[PDB]
Amino acid sequence: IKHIIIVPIPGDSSITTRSRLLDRLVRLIGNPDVSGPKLTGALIGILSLFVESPGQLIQRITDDPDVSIRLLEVVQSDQSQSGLTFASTNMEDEADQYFSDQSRFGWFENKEISDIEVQDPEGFNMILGTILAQIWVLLAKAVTAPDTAADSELRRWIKYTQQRRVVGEFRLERKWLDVVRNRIAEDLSLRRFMVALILDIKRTPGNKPRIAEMICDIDTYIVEAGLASFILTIKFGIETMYPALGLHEFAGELSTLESLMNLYQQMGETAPYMVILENSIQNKFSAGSYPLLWSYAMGVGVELENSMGGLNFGRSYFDPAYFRLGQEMVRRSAGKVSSTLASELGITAEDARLVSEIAMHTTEDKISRMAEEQARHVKNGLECIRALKAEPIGSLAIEEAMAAWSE
Amino acid sequence: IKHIIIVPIPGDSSITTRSRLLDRLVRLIGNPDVSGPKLTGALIGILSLFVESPGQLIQRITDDPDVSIRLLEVVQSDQSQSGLTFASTNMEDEADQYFSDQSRFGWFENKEISDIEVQDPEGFNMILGTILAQIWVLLAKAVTAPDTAADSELRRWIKYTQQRRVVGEFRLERKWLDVVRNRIAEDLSLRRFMVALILDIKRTPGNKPRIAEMICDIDTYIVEAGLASFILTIKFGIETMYPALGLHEFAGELSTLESLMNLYQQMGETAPYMVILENSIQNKFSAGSYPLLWSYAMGVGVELENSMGGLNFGRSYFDPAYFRLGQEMVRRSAGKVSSTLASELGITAEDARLVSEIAMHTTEDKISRMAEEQARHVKNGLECIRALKAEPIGSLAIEEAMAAWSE
Numbered sequence: 001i002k003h004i005i006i007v008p009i010p011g012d013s014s015i016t017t018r019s020r021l022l023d024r025l026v027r028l029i030g031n032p033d034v035s036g037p038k039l040t041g042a043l044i045g046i047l048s049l050f051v052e053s054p055g056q057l058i059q060r061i062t063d064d065p066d067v068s069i070r071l072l073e074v075v076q077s078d079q080s081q082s083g084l085t086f087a088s089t090n091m092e093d094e095a096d097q098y099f100s101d102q103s104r105f106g107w108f109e110n111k112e113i114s115d116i117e118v119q120d121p122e123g124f125n126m127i128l129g130t131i132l133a134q135i136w137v138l139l140a141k142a143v144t145a146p147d148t149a150a151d152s153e154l155r156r157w158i159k160y161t162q163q164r165r166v167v168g169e170f171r172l173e174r175k176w177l178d179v180v181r182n183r184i185a186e187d188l189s190l191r192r193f194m195v196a197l198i199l200d201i202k203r204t205p206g207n208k209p210r211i212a213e214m215i216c217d218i219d220t221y222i223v224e225a226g227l228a229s230f231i232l233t234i235k236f237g238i239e240t241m242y243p244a245l246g247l248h249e250f251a252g253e254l255s256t257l258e259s260l261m262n263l264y265q266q267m268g269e270t271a272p273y274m275v276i277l278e279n280s281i282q283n284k285f286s287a288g289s290y291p292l293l294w295s296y297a298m299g300v301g302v303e304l305e306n307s308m309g310g311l312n313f314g315r316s317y318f319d320p321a322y323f324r325l326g327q328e329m330v331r332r333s334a335g336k337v338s339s340t341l342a343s344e345l346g347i348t349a350e351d352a353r354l355v356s357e358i359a360m361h362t363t364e365d366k367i368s369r370m371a372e373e374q375a376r377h378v379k380n381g382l383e384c385i386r387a388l389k390a391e392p393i394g395s396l397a398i399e400e401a402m403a404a405w406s407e
Numbered sequence: 408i409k410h411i412i413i414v415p416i417p418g419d420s421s422i423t424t425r426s427r428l429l430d431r432l433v434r435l436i437g438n439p440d441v442s443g444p445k446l447t448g449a450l451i452g453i454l455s456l457f458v459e460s461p462g463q464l465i466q467r468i469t470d471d472p473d474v475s476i477r478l479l480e481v482v483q484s485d486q487s488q489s490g491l492t493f494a495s496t497n498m499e500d501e502a503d504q505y506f507s508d509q510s511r512f513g514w515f516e517n518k519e520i521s522d523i524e525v526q527d528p529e530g531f532n533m534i535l536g537t538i539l540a541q542i543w544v545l546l547a548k549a550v551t552a553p554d555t556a557a558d559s560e561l562r563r564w565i566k567y568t569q570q571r572r573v574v575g576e577f578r579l580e581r582k583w584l585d586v587v588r589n590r591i592a593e594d595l596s597l598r599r600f601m602v603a604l605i606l607d608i609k610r611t612p613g614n615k616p617r618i619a620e621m622i623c624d625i626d627t628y629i630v631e632a633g634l635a636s637f638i639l640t641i642k643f644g645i646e647t648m649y650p651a652l653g654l655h656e657f658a659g660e661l662s663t664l665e666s667l668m669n670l671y672q673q674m675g676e677t678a679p680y681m682v683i684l685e686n687s688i689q690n691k692f693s694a695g696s697y698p699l700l701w702s703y704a705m706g707v708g709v710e711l712e713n714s715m716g717g718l719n720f721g722r723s724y725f726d727p728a729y730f731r732l733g734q735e736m737v738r739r740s741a742g743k744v745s746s747t748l749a750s751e752l753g754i755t756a757e758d759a760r761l762v763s764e765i766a767m768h769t770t771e772d773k774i775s776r777m778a779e780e781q782a783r784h785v786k787n788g789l790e791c792i793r794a795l796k797a798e799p800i801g802s803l804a805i806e807e808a809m810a811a812w813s814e
Contacts, residue, residue: 156721161730202774220773224715231781234788241791243804247812258792261785272778308631310717314563323568325812332811366627367609371679374638378668381641384648385665397650404739405654405732 003067005189006041008098009048009055011073011087019118020083021074022049022128024099026116030106030176039183040190044069047135047197049128050211061196067189083117106176110169129211130170133158136218138181139194143276144225145286146315154221162214188277195273198223226275229287229294230260236304237297242329244296253290260285291317299326306366306373334363410474412596413448415505416455416462418480418494426525427490428481429456429535431506433523437513437583446590447597451476454542454604456535457618468603474596490524513583517576536618537577540565543625545588546601550683551632552693553722561628569621595684602680605630633682636694636701637667643711644704649736651703660697667692698724706733713773713780741770 008025010018025042028034034042048054055071062069077085077092085095107113116127137154144150158166183190198219201212208216234257238245245254264271264285275282287294298313303326313323338359342352362368415432417425432449435441441449455461462478469476484492484499492502514520523534544561551557565573590597605626608619615623641664645652652661671678671692682689694701705720710733720730745766749759769775 153716156719160721160725161727163727198774202772216774220777221715223774224713224777227781228716231784234784238788238791239784241794243800243808244811245795246800246805247808254792254795257788261789261792264781264785265789269778272774272781306631308628309560309635312563314567318567320568320570321812328811329808365609367605367623367630367679370627370631371676374634374671374679377638377641377646378671381645381664382668382672384645385661385668387648388652388661393650393653398653401650401654401736404651404735405728 003037004070005037005044005067006070006072007048007058008042008045008072008074009058011075013052014076015121015124016117016119017074017076017084018049019116019124019127020076022046022124022131023116024082024084026131026172026176027107028099029179030172031100032104032106033100036183036186039179040187043135043180043183043190044193046131047193050132050209050215057200061200062193063196064189064192106173106179108169108176109171109173113169116170125211126165126167127170129162129165129214130167131172132211132215133162133166133218134172134177135180136194136215138177139184139276140218140222140225142181142184142279143222143282145282147225147312149312150221150225154218157217157221158214161217162210165210165214185279191277195276198273222276223272226272226282227264227285230264230285232301233257233287233290233294233297234261235297236301236326237293240300240304240329240333242300242326242333244325244329250293250296253293256290257293260289287315288317292319292322295319295322296326296329299323300330301326303327303330303363306369331360331363335360338362410444411477412444412451412474413477413479414455414465415449415452415479415481416465418482420459421483422528422531423524423526424481424483424491425456426523426531426534427483429453429531429538430523431489431491433538433579433583434514435506436586437579438507439511439513440507443590443593446586447594450542450587450590450597451600453538454600457539457616457622464607468607469600470603471596471599513580513586515576515583516578516580520576523577532618533572533574534577536569536572536621537574538579539618539622540569540573540625541579541584542587543601543622545584546591546683547625547629547632549588549591549686550629550689552689554632554719556719557628557632561625564624564628565621568624569617572617572621592686598684602683605680629683630679633679633689634671634692637671637692639708640664640694640697640701640704641668642704643708643733644700647707647711647736647740649707649733649740651732651736657700657703660700663697664700667696694722695724699726699729702726702729703733703736706730707737708733710734710737710770713776738767738770742767745769 008021010021025046028042029039029046044058045054048058051057055073058069058071073087074084074095075087076083077095079085080092081096082099084099085092118124118127137151137158140150140154184194197215201208201216201219204212206212238254238257244250267274275285295313295318298311298318299322302308302311335356339349339352339356342355343349347355415428417428432453435449436446436453451465452461455465458464462480465476465478480494481491481502482494483490484502486492487499488503489506491506492499525531525534544558544565547557547561591601604622608615608623608626611619613619645661645664651657674681682692702720702725705718705725706729709715709718742763746756746759746763749762750756754762
């Protein structure tokens with residue numbers, strides 16, 4: 001009838017248990033001979049290990065109607081082949097059975113690691129943290145779809161913000177990681193649980209402990225990347241409301257987008273994460289479903305913001321003429337703004353024509369715009385410096401700030 | 408006394424001359440045995456080939472007090488080893504002398520290219536354009552300093568926006584490119600000329616022809632990248648005016664920055680390009696001269712904008728605690744804004760305390776902020792769609808837009 005996912009959890013507060021379990025689970029996921037449902041179970045096990053009570057979190061947060069989770073209390077055991085068994089009796093086969101040229105095996109890149117069992121908290125958290133990181137990054141990879149900028153951006157980020165919290169000794173093989181990549185690809189359950197986690201971590205009062213905090217970070221990245229193209233296109237393509245929207249060739253897209261926006265809205269407070277949950281959703285909300293309007297919006301965007309740097313239209317359905325069209329619309333819009341402003345002040349059309357021209361040119365010359373921005377900011381900054389020289393600073397303020405930099 | 412740079416230019420309108428000259432010059436730059444000054448000459452030759460009269464442009468735009476340019480009118484010749492000679496007589500040695508296991512040689516990656524001489528305009532422009540591109544990209548590389556995101560970003564950009572204008576058949580070896588990299592590194596003259604070009608292309612009335620346009624693009628990229636870190640730091644580090652600026656450990660930096668801003672200002676309309684002209688300037692204006700305040704400003708920035716995606720603090724002097732400090736300042740500033748607003752409306756401090764808390768939390772939860780932004784935009788977009796359904800569109804507008812998309 002209903003699908004059960006077995007998920008192992010620690011059976012006592014001790015770190016040795018927690019740790020040995022983590023070890024055996026990592027070990028288990030690397031086994032080439034393990035079945036999907038089991039793997040998923042093990043992963044939800046591992047994903048839950050960063051709270052004092054994994055089983056609790058799992059119980060309260062799981063939100064999948066098609067499956068039922070059977071938690072499995074695990075404890076130490078000097079008598080089993082594994083260092084572990086269940087409660088409660090003589091279920092040490094269950095235990096050993098459960099964990100059954102060591103080359104077909106996923107493990108760590110560093111072959112000098114023999115095990116990741118550990119008796120201290122701080123040390124358990126480095127291992128757990130480092131592993132959890134790689135794991136969540138995989139998800140991000142899946143969600144950022146074509147873009148390759150994140151196996152980069154995000155590993156880089158984690159590298160520089162988490163140290164000495166994310167450590168290289170505990171980098172696992174591609175072979176190991178691919179199992180996880182795969183389970184994420186193939187299992188709606190696992191994905192539901194990960195989204196649930198995201199939500200839980202978000203809704204936490206605190207006081208986020210290091211690992212929670214970093215996972216939270218990855219999460220934010222994923223969420224903004226998920227629907228980037230979409231929002232980009234709406235923001236610079238539709239909302240600008242340039243005459244080019246009337247062109248016959250946007251007609252079909254605008255309506256797709258209308259569908260996408262209505263769908264988006266109908267999804268309520270879940271709307272952002274949906275591209276994580278089903279890939280088809282992510283593919284349908286992708287730029288590919290309205291490539292022209294997107295290219296246009298790209299143009300409009302970079303024209304409008306004078307930026308550039310960070311954009312990425314390195315894609316197959318990117319049409320550069322639509323980029324140029326967007327840009328030109330932006331220019332002509334400037335022209336219009338200026339002729340309008342001009343006429344209000346009490347100037348004639350004859351005389352406003354030229355104003356329109358010059359405005360368009362003003363928009364066009366982006367080097368000058370940059371120059372102006374820079375100059376502007378430099379002026380501002382000198383102003384602030386001067387100001388601080390003057391009325392310097394309440395020692396109270398400095399005291400609170402010190403009190404800040406402390407923690 | 409004064410240093411002369413010999414720079415060859417075409418001696419007639421014909422494309423065969425222009426083309427053969429380009430060929431011999433490329434050929435010449437690849438010669439491992441050529442001297443610096445000569446190479447620079449040849450490069451300024453090649454850089455000028457995209458206007459109807461290279462010599463004119465060179466004459467009017469060169470702005471270097473320490474050197475004097477001797478243009479050299481070149482024309483075809485069925486009698487020299489080269490297909491070229493000078494005016495005006497019997498200076499065909501000058502000519503041949505000038506161009507004197509072919510492995511030590513820079514040339515094209517594609518060994519199937521025998522020569523790039525050509526009799527048509529459209530075809531000369533593909534070669535010239537493709538070469539000029541690689542050239543200007545090198546400069547960009549030099550100016551973007553540590554960042555490696557541009558040998559990427561910018562080649563990608565040029566790839567996708569210029570096609571079929573920038574062609575792979577005409578990719579030159581690293582070996583060839585390195586000569587140019589080197590001359591740019593070692594010669595203030597060449598750099599002055601390139602900046603002059605930048606200015607000229609900027610100041611052009613038009614109607615920018617393809618090649619001009621693309622070079623212009625590269626230029627804009629370079630200019631905004633040049634002082635990014637700097638403006639970033641001023642914008643989010645100083646201008647925000649958070650109490651943390653009072654900390655003893657920013658004291659020394661703020662004053663460096665003050666110096667940098669004063670210097671910047673003193674440089675007038677040249678101020679942006681100066682980081683191109685001397686590397687020491689670029690190094691001094693780099694993040695390395697005020698690393699903490701920069702890290703802080705990074706934090707403040709991503710906290711403030713909820714972005715993320717495109718940032719790059721992958722650097723050695725990046726201090727993440729200062730990032731966190733920046734962030735926290737942003738939060739506390741939110742808190743403050745809200746307590747203030749609260750008290751104006753007629754609320755007590757007791758009651759405003761909590762308001763401050765909640766505001767801080769509002770700032771902190773960035774996933775929620777994202778969510779709100781997305782939702783907001785979706786609403787906006789549906790609104791626009793609805794609006795367009797209603798009062799659709801002046802056919803006149805559509806007509807002008809059509810008239811646009813045409814060109």
